[PDB]
């Protein structure tokens, strides 16, 4: 027949640069989850995301998750550059016992949890201009305290606000205080947002509470790499194409192994 | 569309035993499974969230696990107070319930 | 009705580690910071750090970054402080205090205070010696006499005269650490000079940690 | 803490409309992270979820009931009600009013929408009979 | 880190009087300074926070004032219950720094110390260590100071002192100084004396004894 | 079998533009990316950028962005490089090289390097 | 950029015996995938370059088994078991762990 219908069950390590997220989801590696600290300055043609990947840091959700995942995956890099943000009047490097970095409390390595300094929490109004020649991706978030008492204790203001703005657009997020079900012993949550800062544009972070500040930017590039969900193991074989079921020979005019494919292999037919 | 079977329907165990309750989803539901305990004559209690996260006041002997299609609720040391029906829940569908009975 | 209940006193050898506890009641434990303060004589209070039990957010004084470690058991409404690599300098009283926004983060509710003593000395009973009155002069005015309790460990000793019959006019001075590592203490009473002859006074000393009870007869010269 | 307490007629004639009201104590029905839901329990079929109501007015009902259910809030009294049109003999069951919520946590690679019912009422038996 | 200087460390007053405790911060702490009351047998009490806001349940006679680097706690019409230790604690910067604290003691008329000296007992000597102790009884104020004299020579470093708190019955203090000498060292000297200097004494008081008596 | 024949020697005045081509024969043109490499004697070997003929997606070395643009004609299986604003430093030998993997692949076969010399003579 | 160095103006290699060419990188070329993304390209005189080794210890289709490469960290070596008259040329070490591609200066073999 002219239809390929069987995969070897493995993903060839060549020629595409496969990066295996053993226990890490792309976003987990992006934020710097404690068990995902091995992904730094990474590169890939195809990020393989295992169905068994799990998060182990602070519980969080990503509004507009698909867009961020697609953007980062298409970038083909996780090059993170630290920036010297000047957070005056707030305590930095906040953490939680739900995110065990070492033996004690910890947090995402790429996010900066700002907390009240002493008995006050000023209106942060920092700004980092993008004088470089590449798009900068800033990952920040807004913390959602479980109670009004927790909100005031962490952040002196009774109701916080995060306004990240640039020339193109702005996002204003108001935290939703309330008790959620425990996840690793926490009834609070974190929402992760992202902002692309084009060259010559300026990032403006204005906040009076609940800001999970960024520590820097991810150097974005206009790549064509991709991300794929697959439990197939990676073997030292060679195949010009990859499918979630694994590599498939790409010589036949057609294939029906999967509709999702990466690389140069035939058109899908039901 | 999503349907999900909880087995066994009712199992007999004795105090101090290790008991495992299995709830199987027809499709991969990630970790979107919650476990509820209902002692007779009471409303169900919210035990485990996201298939592994124990809730406030739930004894540490309870533990949930699994991902994808197969989930398990395990009680390390069945105590007298743990006699109750256990329901796995995924969004709007509740499992058929495991009438855990004392031997 | 808010109170922060703290564990009892401790005795640790140098280099050991102790875990102080502070049980909170009367309020939602997870919402307020729990402060930890160190008090030792001659230095006043000294802030160690704080932990927000709900999130586990901790923030330490730089002077205590590695020494102390806060944890909170949310199910028990208890906050813990683990002191590590104890030294003689850590002998102090440790307070846990509640801190929240209603009081603008001034720690408004305090614990009773846990006293931890770091000392390598071996437990031993007091040695009692008499302070016989009429040192150079025979008699005059009101006479003073006492018993020197020396070289005991650990604290505290209790001293009474004539089994409580002479509680009036008796001063029991605080015990002082000696360079050897053993506490020493003095108890003195003022009596009429005439009472010296017709009466002999007994210094009652009891050191429960050593289960030692001593009664000493003090006579002039 | 927050307590839920449902009330209403325990007996309803067939083909009528069933009405129940859950009054929330210690909390506000106007919260924007919790939905308020009604779950039905009968011995022969286990727990069945009827639908849920949000303060903003969004609602969701399971298709198993052909739009017979309707959940609405009365925020001036901290109440939400269940209206189950054209009741039948099969609708006799214990009705629980439960607080819940919807979350999209990133717990696992495959993101899934999680519902929970963390607070439940005592449950009230509702009989549907011609007696 | 903000050093907090609290003065006066020792304050004497009587009921009905008005007193002020000055606390100074090494750098501006805006208005975030709190005052605590520590007294034996009970938990520390928060009196004032944010400079002037007195805590609920605190009597109105406690008043706070100041901003920036200078602050003041004013207690008017002192009650007998107000005599205790007071601490100023800034909560503006993050490493909370408390002041040294001021002891607030009840005033009284000056009283001279009764000086007694006790030679080391024979039982003490048989252990090989001697401990001569000189005692001051029922004096006021707390500023009494003593120095040991053995023969003509002065001795220092080898003596320990301890002072009891105010005796509520008469508001006076008592002080004991013990000089520790080994049997050999004790035997090398003949006459031992303790010099007592106190504001209530017209001239310093000397009590002395000769070895063997 | 797989060969990548390029254009011959090009002479163009400074500031002008030239359109180098690379005829790819012996394989399915749309199934392999194309890389372009610049060689100047002594100075070494320099990478310009890569193009995916399937959809004309291109990624350039920064120092060559704008200085050159890559494009393909899928019908004739020919890959084109256009140089613009030429200067003396642009005198070089340009190699079109087949790519075996994706964006991060490696030069699998190199074409017959086309030399370009800049000057009016 | 990752800079590749190929200090090899004249590598004396008497014909017949083994020869070695050394390349060094300012950054480790080992990817998190376990592969080292070094490449060795041979440019025979008057000819376009051709691939000898891709990554390491992986040979091209037509490359003889004579060529073998290995290394660790940031220093790599190309070892030729036997050198023939046909192996004279410039051997560029290239890396693409981080784009853009960076080539070494190229080492020219000289025979004794
Ligand atoms: C905040 O920063 C922006 C940009 O640096 C500036 O225009 C503005 O005046 C600052 N202050 C406020 C209150 O926005
Ligand atoms: C490939 O995997 C998908 C999803 O797991 C499945 O639907 C499909 O049938 C698989 N194909 C083969 C050939 O196994």
* Residue C61 and residue C36 in one domain: yes
Is the distance from CB of D33 to CB of D101 less than 8 angstroms? yes
Is the beta carbon of A126 within 6 A of some atom in ligand 1? no
Best substitution site from A248, A257, A261, A270 to test ligand 2's pocket, by max atoms within 8 Å of Cβ? Answer: A257
Please give the Cα distance from D108 to E68 (Å, whole number). 51
Backbone angles phi, psi at A15, to 5 degrees: -85, -15
Any long-range contacts for C168-176 (C-beta under 8 Å, 24+ apart)? C171/E137, C171/E164, C171/E167, C171/E174, C172/E164, C173/E162, C173/E163, C173/E164, C173/E174, C173/E176, C174/E162, C174/E163, C174/E164, C175/C149, C175/E162, C176/E160, C176/E161, C176/E162
Please give the Cα distance from E4 to E11 (Å, whole number). 18
Q: How far is CA G5 from CA F107, G92, G102, in A?
A: 20, 10, 10
Name the closest residue on chain E to residue A92, using Cα atoms.
Answer: E94
Is the distance from CB of E4 to CB of E27 less than 8 angstroms? no
Q: Could you say which DSSP state residue E111 is in?
A: B
Instruction: Count the domains in chain F.
Output: 1
Please give the Cα distance from B22 to E19 (Å, whole number). 73
Please spell the DSSP secondary structure of A190-207, one letter per residue.
EEEEEEEE-TT-EEEEEE
Method: cryo-EM
Is the distance from CB of A247 to CB of A241 less than 8 angstroms? yes
Residue F82 lies inside a defined structural domain of this protein: yes
CA distance A225 to chain F (A): 7
- Give the chains touching C; criterion: ≥3 Cβ pairs < 8 Å: A, B, E
Q: For chain B, how big is the Rg over CA atoms in Å?
A: 13
H or E element in which residue A29 lies? helix A26-31
Q: Which residues contact A177 (CB under 8 A, 6 or more apart)?
A: A144, A145, A146, A147, A148, A150, A151, A159
User: Other C-beta atoms within 10 Å of A127: how many?
Assistant: 13
Is the beta carbon of A127 within 6 A of some atom in ligand 1? yes
Q: How close is the Cα of A128 to the center of ligand 1, in Å?
A: 12
Given CB atoms, is B54 within the 8 Å cutoff of chain A?
yes
Please give the Cα distance from A218 to A83 (Å, whole number). 10
Best substitution site from A241, A245, A248 to test ligand 2's pocket, by max atoms within 8 Å of Cβ? Answer: A245
Q: How far is CA E128 from CA E66, E119, E125, in A?
A: 59, 15, 5
Is the distance from CB of C51 to CB of C33 less than 8 angstroms? yes
Q: How close is the Cα of A167 to the center of ligand 1, in Å?
A: 13
Is the distance from CB of C36 to CB of C94 less than 8 angstroms? yes
Give the pair of three-digit tokens for residue G14: 């008497």
Please give the Cα distance from D1 to C55 (Å, whole number). 20
F contact test, residue of A11, A18, A224, A250 with most F CBs within 10 A: A224
| 3 state SS for chain C | CCEEEECCCEEECCCCCEEEEEEEECCCHHHCEEEEEEEECCCEEEEEEEEECCCCEEEECHHHCCCCCEEEECCCCEEEEEECCCCHHHCEEEEEEEECHHHCCCCCEEECCEEEEECCCCCECCEEEEECCCCCCCCCCEEEEEEEEEEEECCCCEEEEHHHCCCCCEEECCCEECCCCCEEEEEEEEEECCHHHHCCEEEEEEEHHHCEEEEEEECCC
Q: Could you say which DSSP state residue G30 is in?
A: B
Backbone angles phi, psi at F62, to 5 degrees: -55, -45
Chain A interface residues (partner D, CB cutoff 8 A) = 25, 27-28, 49-55, 59-63, 65, 176, 178, 180-181, 183, 189, 229
Give the pair of three-digit tokens for residue A233: 């193991």
Of G50, G47, G48, G46, whose CA–CA distance to G59 is shortest? G50
Please give the Cα distance from C202 to F30 (Å, whole number). 110
Please give the Cα distance from F52 to F62 (Å, whole number). 18
Q: What angle is formed at CA B50 by the lines to CA C56 and CA B34, rounded to 5 degrees?
A: 125
Beta bridge partners of E131: E180
Is the distance from CB of A237 to CB of A9 less than 8 angstroms? no
Nearest to D113 among B32, B68, B95 (CB): B32
Query: A141: helix, coil or strand?
Result: strand
| Sequence spans of domains, chain G | 4-110
Q: Could you say which DSSP state residue E55 is in?
A: P
Which CATH superfamily hosts domain A3-12+233-268? Hemagglutinin Chain A, Domain 2 (2.10.77.10)
Beta bridge partners of A82: A216
Dihedral of CA E53/E55/E57/E61: which sign?
negative
Of C127, C184, C188, C112, whose CA–CA distance to C155 is shortest? C184
Maximum alpha-carbon separation in chain E: 66
Beta bridge partners of D24: D4
Please give the Cα distance from C17 to C195 (Å, whole number). 52
Q: Could you say which DSSP state residue D89 is in?
A: G
Measured from the Cα of A258, ligand 2's closest atom is 1
CATH 3.40.50.720 corresponds to the domain E4-106: no
The answer to whether E4-106 and E114-210 have equal CATH topology is yes
| A104:C58 CB<8 A | yes
CATH 3.30.565.10 corresponds to the domain G4-110: no
Is the distance from CB of C119 to CB of C182 less than 8 angstroms? no
Strands (E) across chain D are located at 3-7, 11-12, 18-25, 34-42, 46-53, 59-61, 69-74, 79-84, 93-103, 114-120, 124-128
Dihedral of CA A225/A231/A237/A241: which sign?
negative
Strand order in the sheet with A124-129: A124-129, A202-209, A161-165, A170-173
Record: fold of E114-210: Immunoglobulin-like (2.60.40)
| Sequence spans of domains, chain A | 3-12+233-268, 18-219
Please give the Cα distance from C37 to G58 (Å, whole number). 64
Is the distance from CB of D94 to CB of D122 less than 8 angstroms? no
Is the distance from CB of C133 to CB of C145 less than 8 angstroms? yes
Is the distance from CB of B51 to CB of B68 less than 8 angstroms? no
Q: Which residues contact E84 (CB under 8 A, 6 or more apart)?
A: E37, E38, E39, E104
Is the beta carbon of A125 within 6 A of some atom in ligand 1? yes
Tell me which residue range forms the domain holding C60: 3-118
Is the distance from CB of A26 to CB of A44 less than 8 angstroms? no
Q: Which residues contact A182 (CB under 8 A, 6 or more apart)?
A: B49, B53, B54, B55, B56
Please give the Cα distance from F114 to G95 (Å, whole number). 24
A:73-92 residues touching chain E, CB 8 A cutoff: 91
Is the distance from CB of E124 to CB of E29 less than 8 angstroms? no
| Residue given tokens 């204790």 in the structure block | A153
Please give the Cα distance from A120 to D15 (Å, whole number). 62
Q: How close is the Cα of A243 to the center of ligand 2, in Å?
A: 9
Residue nearest to atom 13 of ligand 2 (CA): A257
Q: Which residues contact F41 (CB under 8 A, 6 or more apart)?
A: none
* Residue C39 and residue C136 in one domain: no
Q: How far is CA E134 from CA C160, E118, F117, in A?
A: 21, 6, 108
Q: How close is the Cα of A260 to the center of ligand 2, in Å?
A: 10
Residue F3 lies inside a defined structural domain of this protein: no
Q: How far is CA B93 from CA B67, D50, D87, F62, in A?
A: 17, 10, 21, 55
Of A57, A63, A82, A69, whose CA–CA distance to A162 is shortest? A63
Is the beta carbon of A260 within 6 A of some atom in ligand 1? no
Up-side HSE of residue G71: CA atoms within 13 Å toward CB?
26
Please give the Cα distance from C42 to E24 (Å, whole number). 19
- SS3 percent helix, strand, coil of chain A, rounded to 5, is 10, 40, 50
Please give the Cα distance from A66 to A261 (Å, whole number). 18
Please spell the DSSP secondary structure of A62-120, one letter per residue.
-TTHHHHHHHHHHHTB--EEE-----TTEE-S--BTTS-SSSS-B--TTEEE-EEBTTB
Residue F38 lies inside a defined structural domain of this protein: yes
Please give the Cα distance from B71 to B51 (Å, whole number). 7
Backbone angles phi, psi at A174, to 5 degrees: -110, 120
Is the beta carbon of A153 within 6 A of some atom in ligand 1? no
CA distance A265 to chain B (A): 28
Backbone angles phi, psi at A246, to 5 degrees: 115, -175
Is the distance from CB of E51 to CB of E63 less than 8 angstroms? no
Is the distance from CB of E64 to CB of E34 less than 8 angstroms? no
| Residue given tokens 């080794």 in the structure block | G53
Please give the Cα distance from G25 to A261 (Å, whole number). 35
Report the Cα F74 to chain-centroid distance in Å. 16
CATH 1.10.540.10 corresponds to the domain A18-219: no
| Residue given tokens 């690379």 in the structure block | F22
Please give the Cα distance from C45 to C95 (Å, whole number). 9
Note the resolution in Å, 1 decimal: 3.1
CATH code for position C178: 2.60.40.10
| B57:C75 CB<8 A | yes
Up-side HSE of residue C95: CA atoms within 13 Å toward CB?
23
Given CB atoms, is A122 within the 8 Å cutoff of chain E?
no
Please give the Cα distance from E174 to F35 (Å, whole number). 95
Cis status, amide bond into A15, omega within 30 of 0: yes
Give the pair of three-digit tokens for residue A89: 């009047």
Q: How close is the Cα of A48 to the center of ligand 2, in Å?
A: 16
Give the pair of three-digit tokens for residue B15: 């105090």
Of E101, E2, E100, whose CA–CA distance to A119 is shortest? E2
Please give the Cα distance from B8 to B22 (Å, whole number). 7
Please give the Cα distance from C27 to C101 (Å, whole number). 14
Give the right CATH number for B1-103 from 3.40.50.2000, 3.40.50.300, 2.60.40.10, 2.70.98.10: 2.60.40.10
Give the pair of three-digit tokens for residue F40: 């100047």
Burial class (CB in 10 A: 0-12, 13-18, 19+), B45: middle
Residue F76 lies inside a defined structural domain of this protein: yes
Of G20, G25, G40, whose CA–CA distance to G92 is shortest? G40
| Residue given tokens 């010269």 in the structure block | C221
Span between the terminal Cα atoms of chain B, in Å: 37
Query: G1: helix, coil or strand?
Result: coil
| Residue given tokens 């590598």 in the structure block | G11
Q: Which residues of G touch A37 (CB under 8 A)?
A: none
CA dihedral A98, A103, A104, A107 (to 10 degrees): -50
């Amino acid at each position: 027949e002219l239809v390929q219908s069987s995969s070897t069950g493995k993903i060839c390590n060549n020629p595409h640069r496969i990066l295996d997220g053993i226990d890490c989801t792309l976003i987990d590696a992006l934020l710097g989850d404690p068990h995902c600290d091995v992904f730094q300055n990474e590169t890939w043609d195809l990020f393989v995301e295992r169905s068994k990947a799990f998060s182990n840091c602070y519980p969080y959700d990503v509004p507009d998750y698909a867009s961020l995942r697609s953007l980062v995956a298409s970038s083909g890099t996780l090059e993170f550059i630290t920036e010297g943000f000047t957070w005056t009047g707030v305590t930095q490097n906040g953490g939680s016992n739900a995110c065990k970095r070492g033996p004690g409390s910890g947090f995402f390595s790429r996010l900066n949890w700002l907390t009240k300094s002493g008995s006050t929490y000023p209106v942060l109004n920092v700004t980092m201009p993008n004088n470089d020649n590449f798009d900068k991706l800033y990952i920040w978030g807004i913390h959602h305290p479980s109670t009004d008492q927790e909100q005031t204790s962490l952040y002196v203001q009774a109701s916080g606000r995060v306004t990240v703005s640039t020339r193109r657009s702005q996002q204003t997020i108001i935290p939703n205080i309330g008790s959620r079900p425990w996840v690793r012993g926490l009834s609070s949550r974190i929402s992760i947002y992202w902002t692309i800062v084009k060259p010559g544009d300026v990032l403006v972070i204005n906040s009076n509470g609940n800001l999970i500040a960024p520590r820097g930017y991810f150097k974005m590039r206009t790549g064509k790499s991709s991300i794929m969900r697959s439990d197939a193991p990676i073997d030292t074989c060679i195949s010009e194409c990859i499918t979630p079921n694994g590599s498939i020979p790409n010589d036949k005019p057609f294939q029906n192994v999967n509709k999702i494919t990466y690389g140069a292999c035939p058109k899908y037919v039901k | 569309d999503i349907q999900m079977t909880q087995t066994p329907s009712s199992l007999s165990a004795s105090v101090g035993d290790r008991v495992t309750i299995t709830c199987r989803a027809s499709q991969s539901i990630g970790a979107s499974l919650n476990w509820y305990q209902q002692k007779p004559g009471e409303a169900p209690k919210f035990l485990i969230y996201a298939a592994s996260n124990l809730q406030s006041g739930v004894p540490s002997r309870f533990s949930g696990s699994g991902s994808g299609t197969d989930f398990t609720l395990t009680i390390s040391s069945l105590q007298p107070e743990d006699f109750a029906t256990y329901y796995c829940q995924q969004q709007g569908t509740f499992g058929q319930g495991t009438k855990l009975e004392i031997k | 009705q808010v109170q922060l209940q703290q564990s009892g006193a401790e005795l640790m050898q140098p280099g050991a580690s102790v875990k102080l506890s502070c049980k909170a009641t009367g309020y939602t434990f997870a919402g307020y910071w729990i402060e930890w303060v160190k008090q030792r004589p001659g230095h006043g209070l000294e802030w160690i750090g704080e932990i927000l039990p709900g999130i586990g957010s901790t923030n330490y004084n730089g002077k205590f970054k590695g020494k102390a470690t806060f944890t909170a058991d949310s199910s028990s409404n208890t906050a813990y402080m683990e002191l590590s690599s104890l030294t003689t300098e850590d002998s102090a009283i440790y307070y846990c205090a509640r801190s929240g926004a209603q009081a603008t983060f001034a720690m408004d509710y305090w614990g009773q205070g846990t006293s931890v003593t770091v000392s390598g000395a071996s437990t031993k009973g007091p040695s009692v010696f008499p302070l016989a009155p009429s040192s150079k002069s025979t008699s005059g005015g009101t006479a003073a006499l006492g018993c020197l309790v020396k070289d005991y460990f650990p604290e505290p000793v209790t001293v009474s005269w004539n089994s409580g019959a002479l509680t009036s006019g008796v001063h029991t001075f605080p015990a002082v650490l000696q360079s050897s590592g053993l506490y020493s203490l003095s108890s003195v009473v003022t009596v009429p000079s005439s009472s010296l002859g017709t009466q002999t006074y007994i210094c009652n000393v009891n050191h429960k940690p050593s289960n030692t009870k001593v009664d000493k007869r003090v006579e002039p010269k | 803490q927050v307590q839920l307490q449902e009330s209403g007629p325990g007996l309803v004639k067939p083909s009528e409309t069933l009405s129940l009201t859950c009054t929330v104590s210690g909390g506000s029905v106007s919260s924007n992270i919790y939905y308020w839901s009604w779950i039905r329990q009968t011995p022969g079929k286990g727990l069945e979820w009827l639908g849920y109501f949000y303060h903003s007015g969004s609602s969701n009902y399971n298709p198993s009931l052909k739009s017979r259910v309707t959940i609405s809030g009365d925020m001036s009294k901290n109440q939400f009600s269940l209206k189950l049109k054209s009741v039948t003999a099969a609708d006799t069951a214990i009705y629980y009013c439960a607080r819940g919520g919807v979350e999209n946590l990133m717990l696992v690679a495959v993101i899934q929408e999680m519902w929970y019912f963390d607070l439940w009422g005592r449950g009230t038996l509702v009989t549907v009979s011609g007696a």
